[PDB]
Design a binder for this molecule. Structure first.
Ligand SMILES: O=C(O)[C@H]1O[C@@H](O[C@H]2[C@H](O)[C@H](O)[C@H](O[C@H]3[C@H](O)[C@H](O)[C@H](O[C@H]4[C@H](O)[C@H](O)[C@H](O)O[C@@H]4C(=O)O)O[C@@H]3C(=O)O)O[C@@H]2C(=O)O)[C@@H](O)[C@@H](O)[C@@H]1O
Ligand SMILES: [Ca+2]
Length: 244
């Protein structure tokens, strides 16, 4: 199944292992799954971040191919373990790819792809927050654009707290800035901007849903010496439009 909508609550599973076959049946498809790091914990999907490791080497980086569209939304709950080691930060949650789906230091300067995802980050002074990681035509650096936004805008996020995250994306047309990127967390708008995802219209469509949970960053101080856990629940995905 290449779905256009999904509603997953993991409520039908016994506490225990969660295979990529399980992931395929809930998501329709889920590529790049690493089932030794997925686990059902009390009606909840738990993802393990391995100690002394970053990116795919320690986390779970899955893409769910979806029905191509020009407008999409999703909702989900995310909770860090009550004893989570924040460390420097990393990627969390469900987002969207457009076109070639640029990530990982490959900026969308060529007008052929981008992504809408979210990170956590801890500053030198110890403030911890969520922040956008947006790859798009006009991203200023090789890595994701934050638009300078953070949730909360003052203070820090908190371990053990359930954050309800709403993500909405809209394709742009041609070379116009008439696309949209939007992230709302517990009712607060973190990001809501016009954006130019692409300049090549053959790559303007939303093509899959990202499910990326990892530490880093690529420097070793983003690592943690303990295995760490992030809990997801209530994923609702909905195609809104396809406008060729
Ligand atoms: O604040 C600091 O300490 C330093 O930050 C340095 O920049 C960071 C960025 O802030 C982001 O954290 C960025 O994340 C990258 C990763 O480095 C890595 O590419 C990760 O890659 C994945 C990827 O998502 C892809 O989907 C693939 O499937 O797996 C990849 C993999 O195996 O590598 O992707 C993140 C991303 O997509 O943005 O990392 C940089 C960095 O430098 O590593 C920098 O600003 C530094 O000066 C600061 O001191
Ligand atoms: Ca549940």
């Amino acid at each position: 199944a290449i779905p256009s909508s999904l509603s997953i609550n993991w409520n039908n599973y016994a506490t225990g292992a969660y295979s990529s076959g399980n992931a395929a049946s809930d998501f329709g498809n889920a590529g790049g799954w690493n089932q030794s790091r997925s686990y059902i914990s009390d009606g909840t999907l738990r993802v393990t971040l391995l100690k002394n490791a970053l990116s795919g080497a320690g986390g779970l980086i899955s893409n769910i191919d979806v029905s191509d569209g020009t407008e999409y939304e999703l909702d989900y709950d995310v909770r860090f373990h009550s004893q989570f080691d924040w460390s420097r930060g990393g990627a969390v949650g469900f987002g969207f790819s457009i076109g070639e789906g640029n990530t990982g230091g490959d900026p969308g300067w060529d007008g052929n792809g981008g992504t809408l995802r979210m990170m956590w980050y801890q500053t030198d002074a110890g403030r911890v927050f969520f922040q956008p990681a947006i790859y798009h035509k006009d991203q200023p650096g090789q890595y994701g654009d934050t638009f300078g936004k953070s949730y909360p805008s003052s203070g820090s996020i908190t371990k053990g707290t359930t954050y309800h995250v709403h993500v909405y994306i809209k394709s742009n047309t041609g070379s116009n800035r008439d696309g949209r990127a939007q992230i709302i967390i517990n009712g607060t708008t973190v990001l809501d901007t016009a954006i130019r995802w692409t300049t090549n219209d053959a790559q303007r469509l939303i093509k899959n849903m990202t499910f990326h949970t990892f530490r880093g960053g690529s420097q070793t101080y983003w690592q943690s010496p303990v295995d760490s856990y992030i809990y997801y629940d209530n994923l609702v995905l909905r195609k809104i439009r396809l406008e060729h």
